[PDB]
Amino acid sequence: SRKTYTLTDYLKNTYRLKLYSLRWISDHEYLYKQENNILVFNAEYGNSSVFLENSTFDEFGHSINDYSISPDGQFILLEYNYVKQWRHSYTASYDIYDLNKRQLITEERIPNNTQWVTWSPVGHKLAYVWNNDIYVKIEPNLPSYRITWTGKEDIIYNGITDWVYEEEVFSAYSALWWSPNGTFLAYAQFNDTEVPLIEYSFYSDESLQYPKTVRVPYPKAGAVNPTVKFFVVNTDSLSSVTNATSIQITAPASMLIGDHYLCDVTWATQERISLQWLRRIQNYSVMDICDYDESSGRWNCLVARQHIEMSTTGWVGRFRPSEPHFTLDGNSFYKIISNEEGYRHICYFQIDKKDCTFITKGTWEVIGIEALTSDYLYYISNEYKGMPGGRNLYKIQLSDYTKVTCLSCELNPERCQYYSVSFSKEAKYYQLRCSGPGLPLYTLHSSVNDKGLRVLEDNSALDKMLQNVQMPSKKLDFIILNETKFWYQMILPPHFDKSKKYPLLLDVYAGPCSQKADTVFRLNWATYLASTENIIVASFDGRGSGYQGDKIMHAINRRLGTFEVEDQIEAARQFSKMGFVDNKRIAIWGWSYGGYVTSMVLGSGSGVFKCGIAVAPVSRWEYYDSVYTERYMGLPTPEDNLDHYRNSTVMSRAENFKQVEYLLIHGTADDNVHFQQSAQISKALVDVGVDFQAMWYTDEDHGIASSTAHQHIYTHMSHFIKQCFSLP
Ligand SMILES: N[C@@H](CC(=O)N1CCC[C@H]1CNC(=O)c1ccccc1)Cc1ccccc1F
Ligand SMILES: *C1O[C@H](CO)[C@@H](O)[C@H](O)[C@H]1NC(C)=O
Ligand SMILES: *[C@@H]1O[C@H](CO)[C@@H](O)[C@H](O)[C@H]1NC(C)=O
Ligand SMILES: *[C@@H]1O[C@H](CO)[C@@H](O)[C@H](O)[C@H]1NC(C)=O
Ligand SMILES: *[C@@H]1O[C@H](CO)[C@@H](O)[C@H](O)[C@H]1NC(C)=O
Secondary structure, three states, X not given: OOOOOOHHHHHHOOOOOOOOOOEEOOOOEEEEEEOOEEEEEEOOOOOEEEXXXXXXXOXXXXXXXXXXXXXXXXXXXXXXXXXXXXXXXXXXXXXXXXXXXXXXXXXXXXXXXXXXXXXXOOOOOEEEEOOOOEEEOOOOOOOOEEOOOOOEOOOEEEOEOOHHHHHHHHOOOEOEEEOOOOOEEXXXXXXXXXXXXXXEEEOOOOOOOOOEEEEEEOOEOOOOOOEEEEEEEEHHHOOOOOOOOOEEOOOOOOOOOOOEEEEEEEEEEOOEEEEEEEEOOOOEEEEEEEEEOOOOOOEEOOOOOOEEEEOOOOOOOOOOOOOOEEOOOOOEEEEEEEOOOOOEEEEEEEOOOOOOEEOOOOOOOEEEEEEEOOOEEEEEEOOHHHOOOOEEEEEEEOOEEEEEEEOOOOOOOOOXXXXXXXXXXXXXXXEEEEOOEOOOEEXXXXXXXOEEEEEEEXXXXXXXXXXXXXXXXXXXXXXXXXXXXXXXXXXXXXXXOOOOOEEEEEEEOOOOOOOOOOOOXXXXXXXXXXXXXXXXXXXXXXXXXXXXXXXXXXXXXXXXXXXXXXHHHHHHXXXXXXXXXXXXXXXXXXXXXXXXXXXXXXXXXXXXXXXXXXXXXXXXXXXXXHHHHHHHHOOOOOOOOHHHHHOOOHHHHHHHHHHOEEEEEEEOOOOOXXXXXXXXXXXXXXXXXXXXXXXXXXXXXXXXXXXXXXXXXXXXXXXHHHHHOOOO
8 A cells, every 4th residue: 555654654743633522511412622722512413613713712821721611501611731640630820711701700719820710510610629629619700618728738738639649549630529419529538747758859941050949748658658538518608708617527437447548529419429449459349329408517427327348359340349330319329339250230329228239240341430310320331242452332121130231232333333422411412432443433312212413523534645655454363372362453564465474563551451452443653664664563451450350350369470471482482382472583572551561561570572671561460559559569568569579679680580581761850650660670680690771851750751852762673673683
């Protein structure tokens, strides 16, 4: 087809994937921006009209980064000076603009360096956090009220997560939760006083004479943890004479016993909150149901409503206990639970009652609960064709659990085996969103008989661009190990001719619950080694991997660095026993858990691998954070699990590295996996005499995501691999 997918094509992004990011603002309408204007859409008719032009803000006087219109649609929130902190957090400066009156707001603007902002889910209220303090703002142009005063950088946090609860718990900077009404504001505060500090240099620009020190409250395995504290503030009751009386909802008795975390918050009604907690040993967690006492202004959580959730095989829930979905009336809910067979399914809960009732079952898992009406429960699963790296949207009949309809399976069977969805308020309508193995598809459906209204986006354009490239093909299959099935994928060179030996790259991640074999269509680096450098990119999901039941996802319990590494290798073993793989030219590269497994699989001394690259890898588990690690390893003490904290370090395999060509890489500014992890790696290698290649990336953090550094690293990983596989 003449040209190939070019390395600069991945880098400079010459083939762009169209999406369809819309925004419901009622049960039948959504926002979507065509070119640069904001159009609103009727979902049952497709008709649209312009809500705001592209040219409205041409004299704003600030680069606009992101907007946020309010529910009543009477005000838009504009984000500028966006400055990035960790994986999700940041400060930003904001402005509010009135679209009834046609002008910007000047009375009491949101303060600069604001950490989080959000609208109430109704009308136009405001809450936000500045210097670790929560402020509400009934009206956009009246004085905001001050909800907490404990705020204190790096120590006290109000309505925003400290660092572990950002990364490991909520995957979010925010610790704020509105009442569907808007009436109540629920929020957490964590105390990082006694949390130890991780320290490193940030070199900044050349002008900077002396390098800076970044210090971060970050608890490593075993260390003192942040505590937490939960409150709920009545917002239709504030006032500027008095200050605000948050009510504190105290954790359950079986948690107050030793360290624990808040792990879920899910409002249930205008007057009833649902929270979970999880002991610092994370095989045990408690759900609590709390209602507003109209007459006292208090909240109560009766033990009758308390619900336990245990694991004797490992930890609880995939990366944490599932979110509950409640019925309109709040007296009952649905939530994914590992069943008797260890497979994760939708169990049904009546608030007052013992047990729960399962309603799904089988050798396959439900992925998430997606929506709930009075007839049907909508959810995503991988049942179809025993295909665990696949996703379809399904419905259950509330009155007859037996009637289960697949909603996405047959829409586009050849293009589309991997969906996510987005429902409108009340679940009147929905967007199905398709990511492969063909190009993306965004289509609109109506939940009444599940009619097929409209095609939003179909990537038409991308399509015919790609026809003009020697794109690679993809292979989803399985191999049997004991007599268990483990799937894998391969990216295969154009005109794959299975009678030629093709050099082979093993791209791993392979941490608890991960899945690198699937049907998603990606354009990345793998796509370029393949179509341009005729190399096979193989990926594989072994023990410890996800979405195929707890025997497989819990095999690695307490034994990180064991079977997950083991399997990876036998898989390569099987891959080279194939006729199109050149057994003299097998490699492995991974990033994060990836680069640690890689490093492990590389000092294994198996003989299978010739070389690999390790980007930003863990190295010794005591060096990583408590929340994530301790979920899996327990505690690094002799009377617990120091035995295999010590058994599983990249470092202790220095002597097997002489059999391979190691290329290790890390960013100086990585707050996630600290340079340390790698530095200890190199010291060991130097200390037992092994030769190897290295690259620091100054100021780059965990993803090495700065355009030039991004470019620079793929450029470097690429020359290494070409030279490893005697490539021209
Ligand atoms: N801290 C975890 C967070 C995580 O995995 N989470 C948080 C919520 C559940 C799960 C979701 N997965 C990811 O965010 C993730 C991150 C990096 C690579 C792949 C997946 C990410 C991580 C894991 C191992 C080693 C380093 C590292 F940064
Ligand atoms: C408002 O209440 C808080 C009590 O937490 C206090 O710290 C703050 O200074 C009070 N301000 C006044 C003077 O009302
Ligand atoms: C869609 O069509 C109906 C019928 O005119 C109209 O009243 C409605 O306001 C239109 N809205 C949009 C989103 O264009
Ligand atoms: C935000 O900072 C800018 C630039 O320093 C300043 O001009 C503006 O007045 C500030 N706004 C507020 C509300 O502090
Ligand atoms: C944070 O906890 C420490 C003890 O670890 C305590 O002395 C301090 O007052 C706490 N801060 C608040 C306001 O909770």
